[PDB]
A paper describes a structure:
Human dipeptidyl peptidase III (hDPP III), also known as enkephalinase B, is a member of the M49 family of zinc dependent metallopeptidases and cleaves dipeptides sequentially from the N-terminus of various bioactive peptide substrates. Crystal structures have so far been determined for DPP III from humans as well as from Saccharomyces cerevisiae. Despite the low sequence identity (36%) shared by the two proteins, both structures are very similar and consist of two lobes separated by a wide cleft. The “upper” lobe is mostly α-helical and contains the zinc binding site as well as the catalytically important residues. In both structures, two histidine residues (His-450 and His-455 in the human enzyme) and a glutamate (Glu-508) coordinate the zinc ion.
Numbering used by the authors:
A (entry chain A): 3 to 726
B (entry chain B): 1 to 5
Write the structure that this text describes.
């Protein structure tokens, strides 16, 4: 209900993984065991990539919940003067920090604080069992992270660069200008930014010193590798001093490679063995190239029983948008739910022609992709998506291929809603929503990954004046002229578009989903025919239009900034459909039954094909054209135009935003199981779908080196404390 | 990349 806090009655759901794990053989279970441990180890690094006080908070909660479980601590907290409501407010906060790996929402980039008096929480922590065993370490942690745990200062509320927000990808004094200057240095030296962080210090003179730190086990000492050690030196780029170092998250990544080497023994085949071998070299040396060679082998391993991927992958939480956050997952293939996605792959090449742009802007060769539905056993990091299109390396997607994944047992969690909280919808459309939101979601996921992220040709010029296309015959469908802009060497998608790169691509993918959901052949693949085939279409469009209005929750007017890539992408689509007008979609502010400001959303079912389809057809073409040519100047002019949030009539979005926030619902928390090793057999441990259940899953998550992982996080945070 | 729930 209130911003920057988590509700006591927040939804918690346990991830269902019992049946998938039961199908695994003894060898595959040991394979999934060590990979899970590796992922959970590396997921701790997200704490260091979130906020300065995040590692201290985890360390404090970890110690605290070790000596006293949630039920034991309850007896203490209530005897100290806390009400049952206040204690639940602390459990929810603790579960939030665990589930996000930090005190900032992974979906919204907003700070959340405990919903209880700080003076009352101090009397509990300082009087706890963990405080009686190790007084110096508990009082030290609370002294350091106590203030920032509750502080809702305007500059602390959102993630971002400059003095506007908080980020640990960069130092405190860094701005957008520093981030762009760094990107040019990385492009010049042909070094990726996925596993790098930037720090800026000043000397007695005042000259800024830039330090690009690679994430690796090894440090300044010489190693066998010559790839990255040749780069570990001082530079001078455009007058600015640049130092390339490594050793970031070294003790943590050390834990990771230990579990990856153990998981190598139980590899199903030679591809998985070489795959894990390169990941080890990537995490020990700090080589993205090594990780790319490992990802290359991963794509070659088609249709495994235990699917997995690890490393610094997605770049959403980076305010500049090129640095990756650590994640990693282990999942079991589900043959039943994967059947429908395989049919879509069979006719994928056929559906690409239906896209609103000439074949000169599509990939040269159609590489047969692998689309599988998986049951997640483990997903470390800030959150859990519904679908992923990995790897993110643009070069690999154009010569090797890629993998599409649909997280099956995660979709079942999302498929749960009462018609009471289905806001901004008429009661007539409420029923149609519930009956089809489930099935129509599967359609949108498939197109978003396979035909959305999977389509696109990037024009690249070689080191010499050699293009990967025919300049003499390729004509721009919007201007009519020949191509006069392209990508160069080192320049990637995230390199040029940066701050909009993520949201731009998700919007181009979501649009493909809506555009190709009209095709009857696609609906037949999911088994939707006749009137039902029309109903899944209307809902797929109704959900999109509604989501565009609900996206105002994730926009900050004072900074004119979007905090969520997908939500911004859905607001843009809403604006495009409004641009067409003709009564296709209207947002009317009304009054709720509770006597509070509310709104309603009308979507004309008939004008979808005659007005909506041509609207997306133009928009999708303009998106792809400015993307393929790397026309960033034009791309921002287009995207940041529709992304503009104003109080202009008749929509008045800024006024609606206060209505969206007034009637918003917090995102569900998800509890993941733990795998235990009984010497001979591997068993699965499940937990309660509650705040206390989520806490217990992390208390039993690191049995061997629990207290050790706390000291490591405290160490690494204390070292870089001067940066913030 | 990613598609959320
Ligand atoms: K990005
Ligand atoms: Mg800042
Ligand atoms: Mg989360
Ligand atoms: Zn996506």
């Amino acid at each position: 209900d209130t911003q920057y806090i988590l509700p006591n009655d927040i939804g918690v759901s346990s991830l269902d993984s019992r049946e998938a794990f039961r199908l695994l053989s003894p060898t595959e279970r040991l394979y999934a065991y060590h990979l899970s441990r590796a992922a959970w180890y590396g997921g701790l690094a997200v704490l260091l990539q979130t906020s300065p006080e995040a590692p201290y908070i985890y360390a404090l909660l970890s110690r605290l919940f070790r000596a006293q479980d949630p039920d034991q601590l309850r007896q203490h907290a209530l005897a100290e003067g806390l009400t049952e409501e206040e204690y639940q407010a602390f459990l929810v906060y603790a579960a939030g920090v665990y589930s996000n790996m930090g005190n900032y929402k992974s979906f919204g980039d907003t700070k959340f604080v405990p919903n209880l008096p700080k003076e009352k929480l101090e009397r509990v922590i300082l009087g706890s069992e963990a405080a009686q065993q190790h007084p110096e370490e508990v009082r030290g942690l609370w002294q350091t992270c106590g203030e920032l745990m509750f502080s809702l200062e305007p500059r602390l509320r959102h993630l971002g660069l400059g003095k506007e927000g908080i980020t640990t990808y960069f130092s405190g004094n860094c701005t957008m200008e520093d981030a762009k200057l760094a990107q040019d240095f990385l492009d010049s030296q042909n070094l990726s930014a996925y596993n790098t962080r930037l720090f800026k210090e000043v000397d007695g003179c005042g000259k800024p010193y830039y330090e690009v730190r690679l994430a690796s086990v090894l440090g300044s000492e010489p190693s066998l590798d010559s790839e990255v050690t040749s780069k570990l030196k001082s530079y001078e780029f455009r007058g600015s001093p640049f130092q390339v170092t490594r050793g970031d998250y070294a003790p943590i990544l050390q834990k990771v490679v230990e579990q990856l080497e153990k998981a190598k023994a139980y590899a199903a085949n030679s591809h998985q063995g070489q795959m894990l071998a390169q990941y080890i070299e990537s995490f020990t040396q700090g080589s993205i190239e090594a990780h790319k060679r490992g990802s290359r082998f991963w794509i070659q391993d088609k249709g495994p029983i235990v699917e997995s991927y690890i490393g610094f992958i997605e770049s959403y939480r980076d305010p500049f948008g090129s640095r990756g956050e650590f994640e990693g997952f282990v999942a079991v293939v589900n043959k039943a739910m994967s059947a429908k996605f395989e049919r879509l792959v069979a006719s994928a090449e056929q559906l690409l022609k239906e896209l609103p742009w000439p074949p000169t802007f599509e990939k040269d060769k159609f590489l047969t992709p692998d689309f599988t539905s998986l049951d997640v056993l483990t997903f470390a990091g800030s959150g859990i998506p519904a679908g992923i299109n990995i790897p993110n390396y643009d070069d690999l997607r154009q010569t090797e291929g890629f993998k599409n994944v649909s997280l099956g047992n995660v979709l079942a969690v999302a498929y749960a809603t009462q018609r009471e909280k289905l806001t901004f919808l008429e009661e007539d459309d409420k029923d149609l929503y519930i009956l089809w939101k489930g099935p129509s979601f599967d359609v949108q996921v498939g197109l978003h990954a396979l035909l959305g992220h999977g389509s696109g040709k990037l024009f690249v010029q070689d080191e010499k004046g050699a293009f990967n296309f025919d300049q003499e015959t390729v004509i721009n469908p919007e201007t009519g002229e020949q191509i006069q802009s392209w990508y160069r060497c080192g320049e990637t998608w995230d390199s040029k578009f940066s701050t909009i790169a993520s949201s731009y691509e998700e919007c181009r993918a979501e649009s493909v989903g809506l555009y190709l959901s009209l095709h009857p052949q696609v609906l037949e693949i999911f088994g939707f025919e006749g009137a039902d085939a029309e109903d899944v279409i209307y809902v797929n469009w109704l959900n999109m239009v509604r989501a565009g209005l609900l996206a105002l929750e994730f926009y900050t007017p004072e900074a004119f900034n979007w905090r969520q890539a997908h939500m911004q992408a859905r607001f843009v689509i809403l604006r495009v459909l409004l641009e067409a007008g003709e009564g296709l979609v209207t947002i009317t502010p009304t009054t709720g039954s509770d006597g509070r400001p509310d709104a309603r959303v009308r979507l004309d079912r008939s004008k979808i094909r005659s007005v909506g389809k041509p609207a997306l057809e133009r928009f999708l073409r303009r998106l792809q054209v400015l993307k393929s040519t790397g026309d960033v100047a034009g791309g921002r002019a287009l995207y940041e135009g529709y992304a503009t949030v104003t109080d202009a009539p008749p929509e008045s979005f800024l006024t609606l935003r206060d209505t969206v926030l007034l009637r918003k619902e917090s995102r569900k928390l998800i509890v993941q199981p733990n795998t235990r090793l009984e010497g001979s057999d591997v068993q699965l441990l499940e937990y309660e779908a509650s705040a206390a259940g989520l806490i217990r899953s992390f208390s039993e998550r690191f049995p061997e080196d629990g207290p050790e992982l706390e000291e490591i996080l405290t160490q690494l945070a204390t070292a870089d404390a001067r940066f913030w | 990349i990613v598609y959320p729930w």
